[PDB]
Amino acid sequence: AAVILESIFLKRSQQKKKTSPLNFKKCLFLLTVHKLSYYEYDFERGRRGSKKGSIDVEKITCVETVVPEKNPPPERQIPRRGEESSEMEQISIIERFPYPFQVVYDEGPLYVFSPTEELRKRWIHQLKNVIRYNSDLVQKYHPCFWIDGQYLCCSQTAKNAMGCQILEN
Amino acid sequence: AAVILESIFLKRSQQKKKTSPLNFKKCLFLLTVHKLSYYEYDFERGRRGSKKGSIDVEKITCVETVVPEKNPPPERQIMEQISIIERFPYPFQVVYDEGPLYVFSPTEELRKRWIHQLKNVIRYNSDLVQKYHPCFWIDGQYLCCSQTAKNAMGCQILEN
Ligand code: NA
Ligand code: NA
Numbered sequence: 001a002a003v004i005l006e007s008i009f010l011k012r013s014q015q016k017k018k019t020s021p022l023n024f025k026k027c028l029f030l031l032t033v034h035k036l037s038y039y040e041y042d043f044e045r046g047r048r049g050s051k052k053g054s055i056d057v058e059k060i061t062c063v064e065t066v067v068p069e070k071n072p073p074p075e076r077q078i079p080r081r082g083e084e085s086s087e088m089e090q091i092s093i094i095e096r097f098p099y100p101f102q103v104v105y106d107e108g109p110l111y112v113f114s115p116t117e118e119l120r121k122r123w124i125h126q127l128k129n130v131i132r133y134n135s136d137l138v139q140k141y142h143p144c145f146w147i148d149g150q151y152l153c154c155s156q157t158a159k160n161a162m163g164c165q166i167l168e169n
Numbered sequence: 170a171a172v173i174l175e176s177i178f179l180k181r182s183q184q185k186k187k188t189s190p191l192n193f194k195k196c197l198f199l200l201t202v203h204k205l206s207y208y209e210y211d212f213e214r215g216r217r218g219s220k221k222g223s224i225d226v227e228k229i230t231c232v233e234t235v236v237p238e239k240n241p242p243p244e245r246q247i248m249e250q251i252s253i254i255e256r257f258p259y260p261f262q263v264v265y266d267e268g269p270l271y272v273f274s275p276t277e278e279l280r281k282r283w284i285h286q287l288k289n290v291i292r293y294n295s296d297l298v299q300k301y302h303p304c305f306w307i308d309g310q311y312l313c314c315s316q317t318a319k320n321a322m323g324c325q326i327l328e329n
């Protein structure tokens with residue numbers, strides 16, 4: 001299969017850590033019609049390093065945006081309403097990741113932060129395409145992050161809880 | 170001073186001997202009105218690491234493009250987040266007494282911005298040259314004129 005998309009995103013850890021040990025780490029994400037996988041990125045050698053995870057596309061049930069953090073650190077803060085920039089800013093495209101989206105499957109939700117709105121859209125559209133004929137697609141989801149033992153949107157404590165919001169219209 | 174430009178470029182190592190195979194290393198480059206410095210880029214830390222070098226701006230005598238290598242490997246063969254940090258096809262040179270310094274940019278636009286700012290910043294220097302070497306110093310001599318001294322006067326008149 002061909003690699004449909006390849007990007008460096010900031011991935012939130014799943015952990016099982018108290019003391020709000022939420023980790024955000026940059027990973028190289030790859031998408032094919034069969035799997036969404038992620039790896040460490042070997043900057044010096046300019047290639048992907050060891051595999052950190054893999055999700056078979058058929059197990060994905062939902063992919064949508066996530067309501068952003070209320071007061072995120074500067075590296076995840078959403079830029080100016082403007083741009084008109086006919087040029088991708090090299091540094092910010094690998095240092096700032098303000099646009100989160102979620103990939104929902106069996107093992108709870110995976111949260112991914114994109115450096116740009118365009119790129120997040122590109123990934124959500126393509127993921128929606130590759131999961132289109134999946135057996136267990138859900139028509140509800142949690143619009144907000146799961147943090148500190150519960151979803152911010154409905155306060156439920158189970159990660160596999162049915163979504164509290166019906167999709168689109 | 171304020172940072173005028175910040176970019177990750179592929180830097181060519183100074184060829185120690187005429188038989189030494191060329192080494193290229195990605196470095197974070199910073200330009201201010203006083204210095205042009207480069208550091209390792211700590212990807213995981215998302216910031217500059219150990220300083221690798223610095224060039225006093227007052228010491229720069231010329232900044233121009235360099236004719237590219239004829240058959241470069243994939244990494245330097247002629248905006249997508251990945252290619253902008255993995256592919257570096259556009260070279261430019263910073264000339265000074267202890268130079269030249271060869272830097273490869275991922276894009277033509279970025280190289281154009283750096284050359285423009287560097288020219289701004291060296292504008293009032295006392296030893297600016299009117300001639301330069303259009304090609305790389307390779308395996309012991311400049312490809313452009315065959316002169317074997319890196320500090321040799323440039324073989325081409327700089328007509329802007
Ligand atoms: Na690559
Ligand atoms: Na920075």
Ligand SMILES: [Zn+2]
Nearest residue numbers: 142153154164
């Ligand atoms: Zn909810």
Ligand SMILES: [Zn+2]
Nearest residue numbers: 302313314324
């Ligand atoms: Zn020459």
